[PDB]
Amino acid sequence: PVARSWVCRKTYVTPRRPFEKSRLDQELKLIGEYGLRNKREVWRVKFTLAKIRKAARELLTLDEKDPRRLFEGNALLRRLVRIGVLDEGKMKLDYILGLKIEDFLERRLQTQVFKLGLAKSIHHARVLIRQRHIRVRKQVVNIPSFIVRLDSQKHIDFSLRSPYGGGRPGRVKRKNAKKGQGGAG
Amino acid sequence: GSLARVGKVRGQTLKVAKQEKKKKRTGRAKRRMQYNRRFVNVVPTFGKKKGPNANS
Amino acid sequence: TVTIRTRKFMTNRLLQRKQMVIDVLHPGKATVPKTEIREKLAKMYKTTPDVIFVFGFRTHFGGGKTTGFGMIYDSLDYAKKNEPKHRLARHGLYEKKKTSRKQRKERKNRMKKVRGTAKANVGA
Amino acid sequence: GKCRGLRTARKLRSHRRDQKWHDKQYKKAHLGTALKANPFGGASHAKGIVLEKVGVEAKQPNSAIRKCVRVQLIKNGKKITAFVPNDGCLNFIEENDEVLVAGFGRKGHAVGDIPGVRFKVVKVANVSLLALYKGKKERPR
RNA sequence: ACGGGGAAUCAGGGUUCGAUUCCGGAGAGGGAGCCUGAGAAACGGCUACCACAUCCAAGGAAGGCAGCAGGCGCGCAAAUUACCCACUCCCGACCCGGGGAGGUAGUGACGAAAAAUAACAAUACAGGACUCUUUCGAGGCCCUGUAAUUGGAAUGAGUCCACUUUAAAUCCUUUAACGAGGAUCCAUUGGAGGGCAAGUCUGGUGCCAGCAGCCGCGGUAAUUCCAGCUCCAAUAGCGUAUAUUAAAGUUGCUGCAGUUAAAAAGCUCGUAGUUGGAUCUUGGGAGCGGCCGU
Fold first, then answer.
1. Which nucleotides along chain E are within 7 A of a protein C-beta?
2. Is residue A8 part of a domain?
3. Which residues carry this modification: N6-succinyllysine (chain B)?
4. Has residue A10 been placed in a domain?
5. What is the SS3 assignment for A71?
6. Contact D49, D72 (CB under 8 A)
């Protein structure tokens, strides 16, 4: 009778066939082209669309101009506009399925270091985010799986405890005070 | 039957000592060359799709 | 540098308390301890640093912000009335007893042997 | 469905309820005949004391001795032929020793060239047969 | 077989599961009878009988963990004889009282979420959209490299003053000084014929020992054994065994099948059951829509 949650779900699909050459071909291209950590990191990217798809397939199949359709069909056209993929005026409940796997990594913060042109390469959209040197509106972010909306893309900027932002020089420049200023005094 | 010659072939493999190892890159670090080597390091040449360990 | 704006101010008169959701801004330093903050509404809302019970500084992911809280009471005659006894040991003028539950929940119940008034022939 | 009628739910359900017993997997999981005759008795594993060793001959074209172990369990007191899984690991098993015994995979069936031997050894008295074969743990005595 | 709220799987239907924290019931070793109280047929009440079992000064007493730890037995199988009135809200005479309820720390790879073990600059050395020249080579804006090159850079493991945190703190956290070049801050667990991603490599074994879910492999050339190497898969996980669901259109409502693969009673009669022929209000009357919809 304890005040404990126990409310937890999985994030990634359990891939039905284990040694499709096509799966080891197609879903390994989603590592080096986008900089990911293992095959588990590739697998949840579909599951987020598998959540979107499952209702979106059925949010067309409701009655024509029904207020349960026209609110919940437009409740997702208030949702999937906001994340910043489908157009501002050319939003449409029918084009929602016309939407592929990397459309998340076109918008998701795991890539957004490389996207605007504020990186070195594709892999560089992990290591700065591994050490929380960026933020979203005076709010530091260490987890690279942040859902950046349409609105807060220009607000993707740097922290104040960051030598690669608007901050102070760090530790090895202070540990070079043992090598450089140890030999200089 | 003959519970005497049990594990006959286990013992008589001349124990060739395990040659030492620089640890393989782990986590994401495995999956960098594994992107480069499969797709983009090589040019598609003439013939069949060859094997990784195919020591012909 | 603790730039405090006393946000969401509300006067409860049936607990006689001036309460607010102080939105705190103090970037660069560590956490702001409970040594300095009661001395700011000594120079902001100009009451005593003695009757106010300031607590609940909630950090966001980064550690350059909290959002605080305090309650002004009318006097030190009201400093221990609409305030439970846990927070009144937190400023010196009150101390809990030391006798542990493995004594106390047993000391009252070790006396359960012999009948009546003079049960105190067991535990001291 | 040979009958399709609108008020035929008390023949579709009753006929399905009858013909489901002719399913050999269903009847096995729903009678009190198979459940009791299982040497384990609805268990995934079982400890048992080794009371002799049997060099079971390999079934067909493969002529080899599958060095197995006769095992009487604790919970039942019923006897079991137990295959010693990895190479020549019968010399880690001695008579009157508690061994942890599992099934093999085909679910109460003789797997491969061991005729009627339905079980395998996993551990020998709280040291695994893997660690004994790999050389990671010492024999517990 | 405690039931339901639910759970797992799921095109659609379905199928298995629910002892487990919320609700309803039931029980306090087994039954049975009762006092008290508004409310028990109560067992952290009592009285017996039946079983179990600790005292005994051997006359006679005392007892219920399916409350919380902890034994013992059982087994494949499951923790420390931690820490309080702070949320709650109830009980009490009642703001002052008191509650292993509620409630915090250990053991915890049952599980689920995040997440390290190099991302960058240029010397190693190979490519190509490219200028040139038959190939050559130079030249190099746009990167792809990675080899026991040089490296610099950092946040976070280990070690940590303190406080925001707490019914006392500890743990992330907020955070000081200290703490990374085989970044010893070191990743294993399985397979490597086929299904099925990945060696016709070398010794050793010689139908032996074994591997192998299935097919099968070993008969002195073993791509399968036992090993070394390199590789492949997943990755702080993975292998295994059992029940169970999908695959199973191999239980068929959607959706199977019955000449010969398993199967139509030998044959009609027949009662419930199941299913049952056509047939009973038709067109125009009255305004508008851009002959005819409403």
1. 21-22, 74-77, 83-87, 98-104, 111-121, 127-128, 143-148, 152-156, 161-165, 167-168, 173-176, 178-179, 182-183, 186-188, 190, 192, 196-201, 203-205, 207-219, 225-236, 240-244, 250-258, 264, 273-276
2. no
3. 48
4. no
5. helix
6. yes
Q: What are the residue ranges of helices labelled H in chain D?
A: 9-19, 24-30, 34-37, 129-134
Of A113, A121, A122, residue with least CA distance to A164? A113
| Cβ neighbourhood burial of B32 (10 Å; 0-12, 13-18, 19+) | middle
Q: Are strands C66-67 and C17-24 parallel, antiparallel or unpaired?
A: antiparallel
Q: Is residue A4 part of a domain?
A: no
Give the residue from C3, C29, C61, C66 with the most A CB atoms within 10 Å of its CB, the best one to mutate.
Answer: C61
Name the structure determination technique: cryo-EM
In order of A92, D103, D132, the CA distances from D25 in angstroms are 50, 18, 38
Contact assessment for residue A101 and residue A46, using Cβ atoms and an 8 Å cutoff? yes
Resolution (A): 3.1
Domain boundaries, chain D: 1-141
Q: How far apart are CA D138 and CA D136, in angstroms?
A: 7
Q: How many CB atoms lie within 10 A of CB C116?
A: 5
Structure tokens at A40: 């588990």
* Assigned CATH for C1-124: 3.30.70.3370
Q: Is A122 exposed, middle or buried (0-12, 13-18, 19+ CB in 10 A)?
A: middle
| DSSP-derived pairing of the beta strands D79-83 and D119-124 | parallel
Backbone angles phi, psi at A166, to 5 degrees: -105, 70
Gap between the Cα atoms of A142 and A129, Å rounded? 5
Per domain, the residue ranges of chain C are: 1-124
DSSP state of D107: S
Residue D131 neighbours by CB distance under 10 Å = 14
Phi, psi of D120 (to 5 degrees): -130, 155
CA-based nearest residue to D65, from D48, D83, D79: D83
Angle at A166 between CA A129 and CA A133, to 5 degrees: 10
